[PDB]
Curated annotation (Swiss-Prot), chain C:
It comes from Rattus norvegicus (Rat). It is found in: Cytoplasm; Cell membrane. This is cAMP-dependent protein kinase type II-alpha regulatory subunit. Four types of regulatory chains are found: I-alpha, I-beta, II-alpha, and II-beta. Their expression varies among tissues and is in some cases constitutive and in others inducible. Belongs to the cAMP-dependent kinase regulatory chain family.
Length: 19, 45, 39
């Protein structure tokens, strides 16, 4: 986490926006 | 120090699962995940 | 959006980022099977 958490959140948010 | 690796195909894999969830509306998301990814792996051969 | 979808996606994704598994679908099978067993 810390950066891994932030980046994961970014990726998930992008997936949810596209879907 | 403390770089994060993003592998290729991560976004696409997540998208494929998510689209199936939002359209099929399975009752148990974890059960569906096991079944979905297991079939994906089997079909890759 | 169904209950818990974001949580499932975040959990898997952050573990991919933390652990750097050699194969994403193998890891998915492993990760979600563990979750199923833990419940």
């Amino acid at each position: 986490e810390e950066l891994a958490w932030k980046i994961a959140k970014m990726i998930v948010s992008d997936v949810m926006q596209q879907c | 120090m403390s770089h994060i690796q993003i592998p290729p195909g991560l976004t696409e894999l997540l998208q494929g699962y998510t689209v199936e969830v939002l359209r099929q509306q399975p009752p148990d998301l974890v059960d569906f995940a096991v079944e979905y990814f297991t079939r994906l792996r089997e079909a890759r051969r």
